[PDB]
């Protein structure tokens, strides 16, 4: 690991994201910054909001500009109104550089805010294509490349615990690194794997087959990237289209159909609990996605286990019971792989390649009878098939 300044940066879970300390502001305001692979712009609480101690105070900072331009995004979740402005930023357990970045002060908003996440803003690491209000306002880790000699590369170890964390402990926890213009090789086991970004948006990529205990789900792959498919740190669950959620439920069912569930538990609502420690991850299915690789008709797959995609969850009575939400939700807006996904892999964006790679994490949950894996390669045709275009 050549990068421990930038190991264990990281705070929180999937539930309620994954967030780094971040400072703006002259004298330096603290903040703490949700990590979200899935937007593209950098905003900060800057006015009172219930859920939030603590907030950007521009007329504290000598180095805040005013853009005189007022900003809106609406996600798929929530959305937020701001105002948009440039001030001094550093990353504390980052690289040690200070860039100016532009900042959307959030002055009102709906859904966005998490009561009791502990964040205060927002950093999203895509492309400028998808950043609001247009192409034209950079993206804080553009500014961050072009302002220093900083690699343009980050990678992501996002840490599951594998049980619930609560108030004081996730405070107190750490949920796992960003390493700014580079990768740290303490963070994972095995091989690194690439897939190509597809295009420089979101973090697009192509999946080109799907197996739930290696049993094909048999779709014609372009179902799997309907009507795109990314890696977004800023989602919770593993979304997937329609036909295909369906699809991958009653295989999902089917393999586990020696304990019956409720329908609220399939559609992502209740949770199911087991007596302590009897979890019966043996008879839930690891899933398999396998990826575009970056040489013609070669592909890999990351294989994820039930450890990821049951998300832990305290039992509403609090009681001893090991409980669960089904982190697998139906999308209208084609794939994405959230965060729960994610903690099963050290996951590098190398956008100097156009290239995300994916290794096993050092911190993903597992048990002694299996393990996420990455592995390749396997011989893949026709890949390029598999991409949607509208
Ligand atoms: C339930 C709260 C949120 N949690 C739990 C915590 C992560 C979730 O699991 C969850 C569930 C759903 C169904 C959606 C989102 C979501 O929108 N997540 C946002 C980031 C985010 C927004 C927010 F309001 C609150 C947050 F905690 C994080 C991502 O950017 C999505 C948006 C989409 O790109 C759209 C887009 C639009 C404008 C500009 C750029 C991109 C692809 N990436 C998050």
Not at 48 to 71: A, E, I, N
Not at 125 to 151: C, G, M, N
Request: glycine fraction near 8%; charged fraction near 20%.
């Amino acid at each position: 690991g050549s990068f421990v300044e930038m190991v264990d940066n990281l705070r929180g879970k999937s539930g309620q994201g994954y967030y780094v300390e971040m400072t703006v502001g002259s004298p330096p305001q603290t903040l703490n910054i949700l990590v979200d692979t899935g937007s593209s712009n950098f905003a900060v609480g800057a006015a009172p909001h219930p859920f939030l101690h603590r907030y950007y105070q521009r007329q504290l900072s000598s180095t805040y500009r005013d853009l005189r331009k007022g900003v809106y995004v609406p996600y798929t979740q929530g959305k937020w109104e701001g105002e948009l402005g440039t001030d001094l930023v550093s990353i504390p357990h980052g690289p040690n550089v200070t860039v100016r970045a532009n900042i959307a002060a959030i002055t009102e908003s709906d859904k966005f805010f998490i009561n009791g996440s502990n964040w205060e803003g927002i950093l999203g690491l895509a492309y400028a294509e998808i950043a609001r209000p247009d192409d034209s306002l950079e993206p804080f880790f553009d500014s961050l490349v072009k302002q220093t000699h900083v690699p343009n590369l980050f990678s992501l170890q996002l840490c599951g615990a594998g049980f619930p964390l609560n108030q004081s402990e996730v405070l107190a926890s750490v949920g796992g690194s960003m390493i700014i213009g580079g990768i740290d090789h303490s963070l994972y086991t095995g091989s690194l794997w690439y897939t190509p970004i597809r295009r420089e948006w979101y973090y697009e990529v192509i999946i080109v087959r799907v197996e739930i205990n290696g049993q094909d789900l048999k779709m014609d792959c372009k179902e799997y990237n309907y009507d795109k498919s990314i890696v977004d740190s800023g989602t919770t669950n593993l979304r997937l289209p329609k036909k295909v959620f369906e699809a991958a439920v009653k295989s999902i069912k089917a393999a586990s159909s020696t304990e019956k569930f409720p329908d609220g538990f399939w559609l992502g609502e209740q949770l199911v609990c087991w007596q302590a420690g009897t979890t019966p991850w043996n008879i839930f299915p690891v899933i398999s996605l396998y990826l575009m690789g970056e040489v013609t008709n070669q592909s890999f797959r990351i294989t994820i286990l039930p450890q990821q995609y049951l998300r832990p969850v305290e039992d509403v009575a609090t009681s001893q019971d090991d409980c669960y939400k089904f982190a697998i939700s139906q999308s209208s807006t084609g794939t994405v792989m959230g965060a729960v996904i994610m903690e099963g892999f050290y996951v590098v964006f190398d956008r100097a390649r156009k290239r995300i790679g994916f290794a096993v994490s050092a911190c993903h949950v597992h048990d002694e009878f299996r393990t996420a894996a990455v592995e390749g390669p396997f011989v893949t045709l026709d890949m390029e098939d598999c991409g949607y275009n509208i």
